[PDB]
Amino acid sequence: LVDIGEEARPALLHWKDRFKESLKYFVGVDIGGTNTRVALDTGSSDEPYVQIAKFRASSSKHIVEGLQQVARQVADILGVPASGACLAGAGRIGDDGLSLDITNYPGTPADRTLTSDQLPTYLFPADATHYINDLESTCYGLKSLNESNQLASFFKPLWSTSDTVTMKRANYLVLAVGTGLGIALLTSLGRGSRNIPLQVMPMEFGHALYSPVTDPAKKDEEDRLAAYLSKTLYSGKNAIEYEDIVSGRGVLAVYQWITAEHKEAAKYESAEEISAAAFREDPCPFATKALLIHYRFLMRVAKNLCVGLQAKGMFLAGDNQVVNNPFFEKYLAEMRAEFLDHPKPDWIDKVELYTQTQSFNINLHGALYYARTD
């Protein structure tokens, strides 16, 4: 059901030609919402890494069965087991890096959990395989791009005193929106003599409870929407998480609430469709409004984390952000107004904001970096 592309084979064959008995390679896996991607990397930068598989998977069983097939196909080409491996995924990581609890999968906690118990040894060696979180891997991919001097080819500034994106020794939030709200922290700890290169801190602030607004022009609408989602999602028992709005499903729910009272309102069934409705030459204000509330709440969590974590900058990552940039930039004043809506605006009015400018699987990029520097 899963097959290694005939486009990747010549590169892998070339690796044997070149490295002969000394061949060693690392495995990276990116478990996306819809597709899981596998790439191999020799670890010398004069040989580009090679994406070997992309297959649809939405359950631990699918993911693991696919990885088993890919492993058998690599065994018939490279003929030597991988020397290390890293898998990135949308969930919490066990203390030892040997498990991943995929937060928004259906099923029991057992159903959502990937371990290395069923991973094929050929690609995932016993003592050198680790799971990491997806925004955690985004941070490693940013570190890798920056060490290769290519970061500015993939990110541009929206708020900055400079026209090019550079990473300093400072705290940076990294955010991406898809099946969930992903947020991680690139952090510089220690001052002066104690300073350490940027470390990656995975986080789960997508699931923190939301913060309200008192701006009268918005309080009424948000109060009604929050009450409506608490009702429909939790039967009133809890307030919403940021992720209940800042996600694919949240975009759908906000739009449905916006159009709850209009039968003739264009029905859509995915954030992708609602976004496309907001991006077309004459968009319907319902779609426009849903996306604005979505992004308002992304700016709301970002503003509180920038205060709390003393971030100097923010990266908006993800291929969907590339698609959404014209809309986000068209309403950047609305974004910035929400971001500065805080009793201490001087604490954050210099925080920089960078956005991804071309599609690129930075999660896979981070997974390979992790595996080969481990």
Residues in contact with a second copy by the rule CB under 8 A: 92-93, 95-97, 130, 170, 187, 189-194, 196, 199-205, 207-216, 226-227, 230, 233-234, 236-239, 241, 300, 303-305, 307-310, 341-344, 347, 374
Residue 142 within binding range of ligand BGC, rule CB under 6 A: no
CA 281 to chain centre: 29
> Which is nearer to a second copy, 162 or 193 (by Cβ)?
193
CB of 314 to a second copy, least distance (A): 16
Can you give the length of the chain in residues?
374
| Nearer CB in complex with a second copy: 54/300 | 300
Provide, rounded to whole angstroms, the least separation between the CB of residue 107 and ligand BGC: 15
Q: Are 2 and 120 in contact (CB under 8 A)?
A: no
Answer yes or no whether residue 363 interacts with ligand BGC by CB under 6 A. Answer: no
Minimum distance between the CB of residue 37 and ligand BGC, rounded to whole angstroms?
8
Q: Is 241 in the site for ligand BGC (CB under 6 A)?
A: no
Sheet with 91-93, edge to edge strand ranges:
91-93, 99-102, 113-115
CB of 74 to a second copy, least distance (A): 24
The CA-atom distances, in angstroms, between 96 and each of 109, 119, 252, 373 are 18, 16, 36, 17
- Minimum CB distance to a second copy, residue 266 (Å): 30
Q: Alpha-carbon distance 363 to 318, whole Å?
A: 9
Q: What angle do CA 156, 159, 160 make, to 5 degrees?
A: 80
Q: Which of 232, 176, 225, 169 minimizes the C-alpha distance to 205? A: 176
Q: Name residue, tokens 């004069």.
A: 46
* Residue number with CB closer to a second copy (37 or 303): 303
**CA angle (302 as vertex; 209, 310 as ends), nearest 5:** 110
Instruction: State the amino acid at position 258 in one-letter form.
Output: I
Q: Find which of a second copy, ligand BGC, none residue 209 binds, CB within 5 to 8 Å per kind.
A: a second copy
Q: Which of residues 187-226 bind ligand BGC (CB under 6 A)?
A: 204, 206
Q: Which residue has the tokens 């595996």?
A: 371
Is 324 a binder of ligand BGC (CB under 6 A)? no
Min dist. Cβ of residue 363 to ligand BGC (A): 9
Can you tell me the distance from the alpha carbon of 252 to that of 275, in angstroms, rounded to the nearest whole number?
Answer: 10
| CA dist., res. 126 & res. 87, Å (int) | 14
- With CB under 5 to 8 Å by kind, the binding choice for 135 among ligand BGC, a second copy, none is ligand BGC
Place of tokens 């991406």: 176
Q: How far is CA 158 from CA 44, 136, 198, 325, 329, in A?
A: 34, 23, 23, 10, 8
Token readout for 94 is 């066990």
For residues 202 and 93, the answer to whether their CB atoms sit within 8 Å is yes
| Binding of residue 304 to ligand BGC (CB under 6 A) | no
Partner touching 44 among ligand BGC, a second copy, none, CB below 5 to 8 Å by kind: none
**How near is the Cβ of 249 to a second copy at its closest, in Å?**
14
Binding string, residues 46-85; x marks residues near ligand BGC by CB under 6 A: ----------------------------------------
Q: Please report how close the Cβ of residue 290 comes to ligand BGC at its closest, in angstroms.
A: 19
* Residue 34 or 358 having the CB closest to ligand BGC: 34
User: Interface residues with ligand BGC (CB under 6 A)?
Assistant: 32-35, 90-92, 103-104, 133-135, 178-182, 204, 206, 243
